[PDB]
Design a protein around this ligand. Sequence first.
Ligand SMILES: C#CCNC(=O)[C@H](CCCCNC(=O)c1cccc(O)c1O)NC(=O)c1cccc(O)c1O
Ligand SMILES: [Fe+3]
Length: 698
Amino acid sequence: TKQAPGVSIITAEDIAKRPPSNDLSQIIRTMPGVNLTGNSSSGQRGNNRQIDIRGMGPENTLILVDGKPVSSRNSVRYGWRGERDSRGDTNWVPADQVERIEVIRGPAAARYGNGAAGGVVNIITKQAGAETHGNLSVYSNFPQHKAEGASERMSFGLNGPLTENLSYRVYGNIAKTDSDDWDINAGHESNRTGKQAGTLPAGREGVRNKDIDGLLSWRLTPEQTLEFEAGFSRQGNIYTGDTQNTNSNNYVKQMLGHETNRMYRETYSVTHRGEWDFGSSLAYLQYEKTRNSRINEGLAGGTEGIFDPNNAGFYTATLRDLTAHGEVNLPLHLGYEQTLTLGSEWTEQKLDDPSSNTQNTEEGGSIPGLAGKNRSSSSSARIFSLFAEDNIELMPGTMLTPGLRWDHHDIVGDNWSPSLNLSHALTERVTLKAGIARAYKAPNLYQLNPDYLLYSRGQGCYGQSTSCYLRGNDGLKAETSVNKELGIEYSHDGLVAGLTYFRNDYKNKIESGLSPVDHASGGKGDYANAAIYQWENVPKAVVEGLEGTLTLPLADGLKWSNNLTYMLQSKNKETGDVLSVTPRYTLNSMLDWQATDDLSLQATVTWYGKQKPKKYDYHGDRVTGSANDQLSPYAIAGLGGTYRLSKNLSLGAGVDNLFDKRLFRAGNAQGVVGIDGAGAATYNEPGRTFYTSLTASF
Ligand SMILES: C#CCNC(=O)[C@H](CCCCNC(=O)c1cccc(O)c1O)NC(=O)c1cccc(O)c1O
Ligand SMILES: [Fe+3]
């Protein structure tokens, strides 16, 4: 089945029956335990939501492609409120070249180490066969309301042998998601007065994709395979007025409808795969090089994350991420029947960011140990990792899986991430699963860097109205989380019913500090001698909730599927405010009718629970008026079909949001001067949208 406790598979067949507009987040987010949220609670960059596992935030969701990490978003400035102006890393592989997606949540994900505290999403590509196969896939949607951006997508794939011990697969994708109109949120915006009169919270950013992957597999012996692949991808946006605080200037408006960020992603990988008597071997080298070219932004207060008109033009942030991995797998025949897995991992993240480290000290006064001008652009961290998994069959149908992961971070120090995963046949139809692991989060290179410096004149300073600096802190501890889960599942003749309780106890969550550690000296007027805060480790936070699934075969041709997320608790135990904003629950419901040998029909509903905003502003004071606004529970319904014309040609057509339930970004969560808050109303929900698709394949 596609749902066990803690784990979800999405197949190629699922991707075809609920086609995504462009980004995979659309379908990945319908799994149990998965939400589409920002990383903290500000609502900043709120139309740029990313996959979130069990409310742990999307920085704790590790994205792999064919088991190789994607780190491209680590090239985008990490802001005061824990958001990046990033669309995330689930849009690098085109939907129709994906074989399957694996979602691994909680204690079962800890063993993947750094940034798996939420879980792992592994996007797996279609491979060459015994003969040559290929496909040509085209998808095109059509919103009811013209304001909302339509999406168009064309991908091929082409694979096969070249010799009897040489395979290849290649694909290429060209896609575009038009931006929402600059004015989609007009009449829905928060109250905006004085200097900020006329300002708008933005709709969805558009994106243009160009993806090209080539792979050669070479099985130079019976039990010895060697893979080389290169990836070239490029996303350029279509700008539609988005700024961190929803403030505006002239440069912003000049750029409406233009490309204001381009991400070039280049991946080369060498992968050796081994299979013999004693067991199985795997090792890879990945070089990921990300170029994040975008218009210079300010780094101070309300100018944080708006185009800087004094320093017009593009800069380029460069991320060179180097990953090498070794594992073996040993079948052991002892007192207890078991399989042992032994691994090292080595990673290097080099970040060149010529823009983020340029905030100067002329106004808030100078900071002992921090040069005001021409600070380094450079950040790096190396983690070295050893791990062993023992997959022990006590008595058939029972597995006990203990593993130790140890990591040496060359700044933060040593991490010990132990794990234990039990699965228990109570009956041939029923399985109990328990897991308790301590997962691992290395600070990102922004949090870690004493050259990385934000400034506010007060509005953004915790527990005061005076000027303050926020500073990077190489003294930080890693974030660790003891992810507990207890779950039960009945599964028989395609009848599946399961419910999991999960609690992650979250230690040292890194976050903009609450107490000044220091005060700068000098500067201008009432702003002089500003307070200095760092990125602090929050001692304790907790997330808690329920994952459910229920699958009933109504008749032979008819399948009724349901996935449930229910989020019980999400609490920074220091401030008592929420970590993210999720829907209280999410129920995704598919009816799948195989009407004929050739015609398949799909009805879907998603129910979203209530969504409540943070209680406290940047000051730590209680928010008031429209900053308290909640989003009422709502549902989105859809019909679709796929009519197979032959073995070589299939056609799809359907409607997302049948009943045209629409939501509009009113702005960020809290009030600032001249821009009232928008509470939980921080994203655009698209209206009725027709779509059509065509797949030709040998
Ligand atoms: C009017 C006026 C004063 N200056 C400005 O027009 C601009 C825009 C500020 C308007 C909206 N403010 C915020 O959303 C905000 C968010 C986080 C922290 C904050 O401090 C915020 O203000 N700011 C600045 O030029 C500025 C410069 C240095 C330090 C600051 O805090 C600034 O706001
Ligand atoms: Fe300000």
